[PDB]
Amino acid sequence: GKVLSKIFGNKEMRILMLGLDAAGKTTILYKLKLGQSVTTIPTVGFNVETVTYKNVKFNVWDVGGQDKIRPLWRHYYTGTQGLIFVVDCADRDRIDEARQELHRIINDREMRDAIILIFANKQDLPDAMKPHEIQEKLGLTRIRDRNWYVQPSCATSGDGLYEGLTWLTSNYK
Numbered sequence: 001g002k003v004l005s006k007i008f009g010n011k012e013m014r015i016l017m018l019g020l021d022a023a024g025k026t027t028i029l030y031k032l033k034l035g036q037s038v039t040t041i042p043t044v045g046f047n048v049e050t051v052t053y054k055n056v057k058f059n060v061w062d063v064g065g066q067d068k069i070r071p072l073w074r075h076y077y078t079g080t081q082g083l084i085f086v087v088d089c090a091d092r093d094r095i096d097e098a099r100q101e102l103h104r105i106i107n108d109r110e111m112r113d114a115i116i117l118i119f120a121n122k123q124d125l126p127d128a129m130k131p132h133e134i135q136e137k138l139g140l141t142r143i144r145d146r147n148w149y150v151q152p153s154c155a156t157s158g159d160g161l162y163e164g165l166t167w168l169t170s171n172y173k
Ligand SMILES: Nc1nc2c(ncn2[C@@H]2O[C@H](COP(=O)(O)OP(=O)(O)O)[C@@H](O)[C@H]2O)c(=O)[nH]1
Pocket: 019, 020, 021, 022, 023, 024, 025, 026, 027, 028, 121, 122, 123, 124, 125, 153, 154, 155, 156, 157
């Protein structure tokens, strides 16, 4: 509200918020009070949520699906200026799949200039990977071509969310 109003203002931005299922995307939106959305289903089993806030638009969907739906993802790339990629830091077994999904998205032709915010989510859970190991595990340390940042978060209690969004808004072009 007053916080979102100060961070976003009347700024115009097109943002994707992606991550594997269970990473914490729905919780992040509920915590920011972005309770309403519009669902589109471009093919059975592929659900997209779109949230508008003033001159901001988010598109949100789970990655990690069937390979055959990957062509449909690029319908959402044109004009996208910010990618928010949400990672469950307690799920050590799927970090390599999250790495491969991320690099698949940012290597698309139409995604060459989006900056990358990582939410390193679920920092409160037993033996969650820390921001600095997430940097290495997601292969970010080797990305020299663009600006990126890893924000530790606990989406259930709201920690790190406003800090992450302040990075994104201050760095987007
Ligand atoms: N402990 C903990 N659980 C979280 C956190 N964020 C999300 N969750 C839980 O993880 C599950 C998946 O979250 P959800 O928002 O549905 O993920 P989505 O599938 O990406 O939308 C739910 O049970 C959330 O409450 C967090 O930071 N800490």
